[PDB]
Design a protein around this ligand. Structure first.
Ligand code: HEM
Ligand code: HEM
Ligand code: HEM
Ligand SMILES: *[C@@H]1O[C@H](CO)[C@@H](O)[C@H](O)[C@H]1NC(C)=O
Ligand SMILES: *[C@@H]1O[C@H](CO)[C@@H](O)[C@H](O)[C@H]1NC(C)=O
Ligand SMILES: *[C@@H]1O[C@H](CO)[C@@H](O)[C@H](O)[C@H]1NC(C)=O
Ligand SMILES: *[C@@H]1O[C@H](CO)[C@@H](O)[C@H](O)[C@H]1NC(C)=O
Ligand SMILES: *[C@@H]1O[C@H](CO)[C@@H](O)[C@H](O)[C@H]1NC(C)=O
Ligand SMILES: *[C@@H]1O[C@H](CO)[C@@H](O)[C@H](O)[C@H]1NC(C)=O
Ligand SMILES: *[C@@H]1O[C@H](CO)[C@@H](O)[C@H](O)[C@H]1NC(C)=O
Lengths: 681, 681, 197, 49, 144, 49
């Protein structure tokens, strides 16, 4: 019942019932410039104009170098038990212990203003405002990353982002430079496959799993440690769109995911995730056929099962997007007592990069003093001055060691003051090198494991995604280099992808082929645990009392927890949205109300209120994109017009009571994969 | 008796009895780098090192473009009356009405580390934290300014500041470019003369008067205006040093003025100023022999006497210099209801300049949100975002006009909301021109008026100052140009400056010569109203029990409010300062304790504990710089070693009661002018 | 320039906004911003100063630099000059002129000068966007303002919103027409670079 | 152009830009605040057309 | 006769015998503000005033966190021999091999404007503009 | 020290003026680059590290 943003209330400003003022006080007006005469030039002495305009002119700050496009919200994490047996972290140190949290979801390549539903790796950054400092798990919705060394990050990001000569294409990897890098740097192949699957185009932020990706360390009070992988398990269930749907949705509504997250929290349907961890000993570093320090590899659950530690729930939206969401500054270096890093070369470089990049975004050192960045545990140190210094320090002896300050602020370590400490057992041994380990060399085995662990239709989506993006590559040799690398993962994949490009795939390379499968890498395979907050489009008409029983259909669906929108020609009594403003991409299921066949047919389907064939296009798109479709009573003729029979799965024709039962259980399936063709008939 | 810094308490951080932390929380230690082995390299994953060092690396901000060297303090202003009939200003709205204030004093040309006692114009920036916005009077210690147009400000500052090829000389106008500008731009001659007098080298900030310089408008609630000049009249009295003294003081103690201001407030001797004004009618703008819009002119008090509005008192030093003093952002554009600008071309350009330059220093538009810059009257507007946005605005409808926000924040003007309004009666007429009025053409009359109003020795100080600086000018034609301009002011001044340069003075030019004099432009003319916080140096010796008499002598002098310093060879019991650490520049008076003659002769004046002849040099310097000097009992031998007669003005000899009575009387006179020679001899 | 109050404020705004984007006063020194005609003045220092000025006497007026860089005006040096005939007259005022009062005549003039189908696209655009407004009173205010421009436009847009904005308000109605405002009326003079699938 | 005085430029852009609470919608005037400004400020009607 | 500042000659600006201009080109006068009348207020449309004053207002950059007070000069380093037996450094790769250098001396504690003759540790930083990249020996006048 | 204190006030630019005047007058200062070479195994051989 405690507010998640309670600490931020002191900095909130209410402008209701007030006069307009300047930033230095004093009441004013700001609707007229000061002029020298009735039709005169504007005066330089006009201080009210310049102070207003100066602030407007300096509103924009630099966007994030990566993950510029994103959205977030506040929440509460609750620990299920006392985890002192495995870690000294205070936020996991007791049963029912609650910690405030802020989570920001994002894409990667796209700039600010780009579409939510573009194919990309997604961000999953979570902060724990704990009683021993801020702890951040900066992660993604895919358990492996492209590159093995952090020094290669600019090379990866330059290649995937728009071509520097024309800045094209926007928020897309479907171009020469991206697929040049994937083929030239074959370690990226694994994350490529995840990005080409359902994880590239998820339904929403709520329907994503999250991963810390890197192997971290969890340290106890006595110094003993264990290797750990972070996992966020979605309670809303995993769900993904189709690509042809995602493209249209990008233009129809670029704010799809952020508005979805916003509407969920406002409607009283706060999304939740369970924090889980894979715990293994130090001596299992190179035990399971790969190196745990390698970020391009994940650990199958068959070797180490998930151990649930707690649950996070996001229940408070921000009041100002910029001040909270845009200004927040996540860091993987934000670590607390009880946790420790590993020698993962990609992770190692991130610790520097995130702290450095805040100097560019916030244009100063004092970015942690911002309300959203502030901890709840207190800040006491000899840091002075800097740009935008918000506090006034009382200790005039800002140094250590010192007699004058009486040894305060004091030093804290493992035994005293509950201070951070590196794992005492950690050792370094060997020559100083600019090399990668020989255990990092395998780039093809896990990609094959991931591809094998998908369903036949899910395997088709990945191949169709590669076909689409690879066909945009103009350079012939680059496409040959791509098929060469795909052939090392799988010959059948390389064969099928080569068909679209009009090239001959190379002969089988059986070095890295295998028939192994792994658990829990699938999406369109498992049904959703709840259909709450899912969207239904009720296609109705203003003419002939069709809207009256469409409202009854809407009323019944809302009881089960569904978000319903009644569509008509114009905004009549009961109509939520017009056909002009309506699209199939904004719904999980399209239902044709009885008496609404007139808008699919001759006279009625060609009204000036909406574009030609708009009602018919919505139902057609919905069916082709695999959504549960329906048609009540005599509305089954609407299905007959588009050419869809009333027998096939995911199509529900009949009485009002039967349609509701069929549509609701159809939403659990979400996508019906039998409507999508597989290679070989 | 309210604390002037009471609003600032909430942003104060105490680190006493606390453990060391990072900027994002969590206890730590930061006295050892994380190393890979006993004698190994420092690790990149060491987040404790980089977060500490980053803040240190980014501590510095750009200094002020001018008035970089300065210091300040908090205080309270008290109005003597209700001043509603002359102005609508709220802080002058009632009797005994208290308003918090912060005041900063400065030089002009010197950089942040320059000496306080360098010859320059001094800043006098005062802020009023009133209940209707921040009102700033950004003034100087000199009533007139160099230039007549604000577009010429870079030309003035570039000429006075160091030469751009070698950056020499620091904090000084004694070089070619400065006097090239003064001679080439004759308007600067008036402020030059003020700068060459005692105003250039004041005793302390506490012994300075202040001036707004520009003519402003005081507007009543009904909309009636009066032309106004701001004046700060010191209650400590005006006092200034000699040049040869100031040069030595610049090296011995660069922090002389700011340490003095600190010690006065700390000892409980808070300085005070009376706020006074000269009220002129609108039709009397050009009625006093000059133009009131001209900033190079001052209005003699014979035409318009001062009207005392209230009193200011500075009683609180800052906790943090950087957070408060360095970060404060004064602006002439900080105006409130009841005050208005005029058409002074210098003032017009300032309004733009000060707001603009804050973007340089603070690297963002939210500099008014800084604790020192915040108003106490509240801020409500549609300003959003910007670098380092500290608040979270609740109003989502951040624009006007608007139905959704219900017209809030509302507009305020003359009759509604007590909003700012320009003087209703003001008008504009004529062609758009890049010209200066013909009424600005007289550059030489007031400089002559200023020189006539000084005493013979004060007139000699001005000429000796010109002689010193003009001799540094290497270019001969530039020196000839200076004599040409000086001759237009006065022939006698030109001839007396020419002889030092070894040049023939030009023939008399009687166009602007006159014998008029004015009141209150002098300094040494008057005696001090109080001798509190004044400094006495007691020269004693550790041998022969001289400390007993020196201690009893000290005890008596400190009872009249003086800060006394007992000086000896080493820090014995009752000794405040050693001879090695002592200098004449630190004291207002020098008294030789009885039995301290041994340190003026052979052995005794040749100790290893201090440089040779130090005790005699302190007394010699003290006498030569015109300070009250004394010698108790047999200490008369010490005055005779330096050839000083015991019965001349400001020289006191005899018993302890006689010496104390004389010195206390001599400190009110402060400077004895009869020890400085005048021209002719 | 002219006394256009909108133009007047831009002159300030565009110069100030570069300080945010470029984080320094030397943005004109960037190769894309540099002029071809040359730069000579007393501007020194600042963030990212790319040149090394040879003139040590960086001020005017001055004997030491012999008055160079020199002042240029209308008659000498081909300098910039404000129009000699321009004048100012009247009280200092925070208000717009009474001649700026009409907001409805030209909007109608534009709508009149479009083709029947082009007029439909404009209404269809308003119909689409106005339906996204959730607040009922805001939509009523929109139709109220649209009714002042044209009655038929207000009524046609109103039917999509599902309410009436009927009663004509003919203070500003007219049938005047002007050239060149339409797009779909004229034919293209060339079909070069036009795409064909 | 929409407005007649340059001091009203922040008001125009703030209304057409995405809503400050959620930063929605992107690159569109089809929302409450934009049309609230157009109706409240009739000068904008011409450029709207 | 070798000029140490030879490479810097390309960025040098000569203002002798030139007319006054803005930072975006075009000749101007910049000694009078544009006023609405003989004794009138300054106009906001005075682009010449603001462009001149903006550059002045933003002249200052932050001083060095330490060694703020200093002064430098250009020079030439000459190697007495081929030191390939001790180092692969190119600027020490042959006898009579010349390399341009810049040296800046300084104090430590004092800010900009502080005295040279204050008691402090002093800086001695030297840059070698070598043919295989810039090499800096950032040092002091005290060995520890 | 007693010389340095007075010099700081009389001429704060003492050292930079000195360096400048030396170069202008044709009296350019010079320094010899010298090195102390030690073997790797003798890093802790001279009574310290
Ligand atoms: C598997 C490893 C990685 C993960 C899980 C990851 C994830 C993320 C996420 C989620 C964000 C957005 C944070 C937010 O919500 O604001 C982000 C931004 C960023 N990433 Fe990474 N990324 C990875 C690799 C890297 C690497 C190797 C580098 C370079 C060393 C890097 C540099 C950055 C930077 C500079 C930002 C902007 C941070 C800010 O502006 O606050 N990332 N990353
Ligand atoms: C009546 C003549 C003037 C007086 C009395 C005056 C006074 C002052 C004072 C006291 C300060 C330091 C404020 C502080 O204590 O922090 C200052 C700084 C400054 N002055 Fe002036 N000044 C005058 C003329 C001008 C002119 C004509 C310009 C150019 C248009 C100008 C530009 C500046 C700037 C940019 C600063 C730095 C502001 C800051 O960084 O906060 N001044 N002036
Ligand atoms: C080991 C003995 C050291 C020496 C001989 C030394 C030398 C110097 C010198 C000569 C400069 C001025 C360079 C110039 O001419 O512009 C300087 C500045 C500086 N020093 Fe050091 N330093 C030492 C130790 C350190 C340490 C331990 C740190 C912190 C890790 C540090 C941090 C800095 C920084 C941040 C600057 C400013 C650099 C700039 O702004 O360009 N110094 N030091
Ligand atoms: C922690 O610091 C204490 C002193 O505060 C010290 O005695 C102890 O050795 C430190 N702990 C460890 C394990 O190094
Ligand atoms: C596949 O899984 C089996 C488990 O039986 C394991 O032994 C093997 O190493 C895995 N990899 C391959 C390529 O067979
Ligand atoms: C001030 O605003 C009010 C409306 O709030 C208006 O009636 C009045 O005309 C305005 N001007 C003056 C001079 O009060
Ligand atoms: C000096 O004497 C008094 C102040 O004691 C002052 O009134 C007078 O004006 C001064 N003399 C001159 C010539 O101004
Ligand atoms: C000097 O004073 C006289 C008498 O007040 C006055 O008439 C005259 O205008 C003043 N100015 C000069 C320089 O003569
Ligand atoms: C155009 O119509 C307007 C109506 O607003 C009218 O005042 C004007 O006379 C007409 N001008 C012509 C003849 O085009
Ligand atoms: C390296 O060779 C040079 C001559 O080329 C010689 O003077 C020097 O002694 C040698 N240095 C060492 C340490 O071997």
């Amino acid at each position: 019942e405690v507010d998640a943003r309670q600490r931020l209330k002191e900095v909130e400003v209410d402008d209701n019932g007030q006069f307009m003022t300047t930033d230095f006080g004093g009441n004013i007006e700001e609707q007229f410039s000061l002029k020298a005469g009735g039709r005169g030039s504007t005066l330089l002495e006009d201080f009210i104009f310049r102070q207003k305009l100066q602030h407007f002119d300096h509103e924009r700050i630099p966007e994030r170098v990566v993950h510029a496009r994103g959205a977030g919200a506040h929440g509460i994490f609750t620990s299920y038990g006392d985890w002192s047996n495995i870690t000294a972290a205070s936020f996991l140190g007791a049963k029912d212990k609650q910690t405030p949290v802020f989570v920001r979801f994002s894409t990667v390549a796209g700039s600010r203003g780009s579409a939510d539903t573009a194919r990309d790796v997604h961000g999953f950054a979570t902060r724990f405002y704990t009683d021993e400092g801020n702890f951040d798990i900066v992660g993604n919705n895919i358990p492996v990353f492209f590159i093995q060394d952090a020094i290669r990050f600019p090379d990866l990001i330059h290649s995937v982002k728009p071509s520097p000569d024309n800045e094209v294409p926007q928020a897309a990897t479907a171009h020469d430079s991206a697929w040049d890098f994937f083929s030239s740097q074959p370690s990226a192949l694994h994350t490529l496959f995840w990005a080409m699957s359902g994880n590239g185009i998820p339904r929403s932020y709520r329907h994503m799993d999250g991963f810390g990706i890197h192997t971290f360390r969890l340290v106890t009070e006595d110094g003993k440690s264990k290797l750990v992988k972070w996992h966020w398990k979605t309670k809303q269930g995993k769900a993904a769109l189709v690509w042809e749907e995602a493209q249209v949705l990008a233009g129809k509504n670029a704010d799809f995911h952020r508005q979805d997250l916003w509407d969920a929290i406002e409607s009283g349907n706060a999304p939740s995730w369970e924090l889980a961890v894979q715990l293994i000993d130090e001596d299992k570093a190179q035990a399971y056929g790969f190196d745990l320090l390698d970020p391009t590899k994940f650990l199958p659950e068959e070797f180490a099962p998930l151990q649930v530690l707690g649950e996070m729930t996001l229940n408070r939206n921000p009041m100002n997007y910029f001040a909270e969401t845009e200004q927040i500054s996540f860091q993987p270096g934000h670590i607390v007592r009880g946790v420790d890093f590993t020698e993962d070369p990609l992770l190692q470089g991130r610790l520097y990069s995130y702290l450095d990049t805040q100097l560019n975004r916030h244009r100063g050192p004092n970015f942690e003093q911002l309300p959203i960045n502030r901890p709840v545990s207190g800040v006491h140190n000899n840091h002075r001055d800097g740009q935008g210094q918000a506090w006034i320090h009382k200790n005039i002896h800002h140094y250590s060691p010192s007699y004058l300050n009486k040894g305060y602020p004091a030093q804290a370590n493992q035994t005293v003051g509950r201070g951070f400490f590196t794992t005492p057992g950690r050792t370094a041994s060997g020559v100083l090198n600019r090399e990668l380990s020989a255990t990092f060399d395998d780039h093809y085995t896990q990609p094959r494991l991931f591809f094998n662990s998908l369903t036949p239709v899910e395997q088709q989506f990945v191949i169709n995604a590669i076909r689409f993006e690879a066909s945009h590559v103009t350079n012939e040799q680059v496409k040959k280099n791509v098929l060469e690398q795909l052939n090392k993962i799988s010959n059948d994949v390389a064969k099928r992808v080569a068909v679209a490009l009009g090239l001959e795939a190379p002969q089988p390379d059986p070095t890295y082929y295998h028939n192994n499968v792994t658990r829990g890498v699938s999406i369109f395979n498992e049904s959703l645990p709840t259909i709450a907050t899912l969207r239904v489009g009720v296609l109705s008409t203003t003419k002939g009392g069709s809207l009256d029983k469409a409202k009854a259909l809407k009323e019944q669906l809302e009881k089960d927890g569904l978000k319903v929108t009644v569509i008509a020609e114009y905004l009549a009594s009961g109509v939520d949205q017009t056909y002009s403003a309506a699209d199939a991409t904004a719904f999980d299921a399209v239902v044709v109300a009885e008496g609404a066949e007139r808008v699919f047919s001759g006279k009625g389907a060609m009204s000036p209120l909406f574009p030609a064939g708009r009602p018919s296009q919505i139902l057609t798109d919905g069916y082709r994109w695999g959504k549960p479709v329906a048609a009540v009573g005599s509305a089954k003729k609407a299905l007959q017009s588009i050419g869809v029979e009333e027998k096939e799965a995911g199509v529900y024709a009949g009485a009002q009571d039967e349609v509701i039962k069929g549509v609701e259980e159809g939403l659990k399936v979400f996508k019906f994969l039998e409507r999508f063709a597989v290679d070989g008939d």
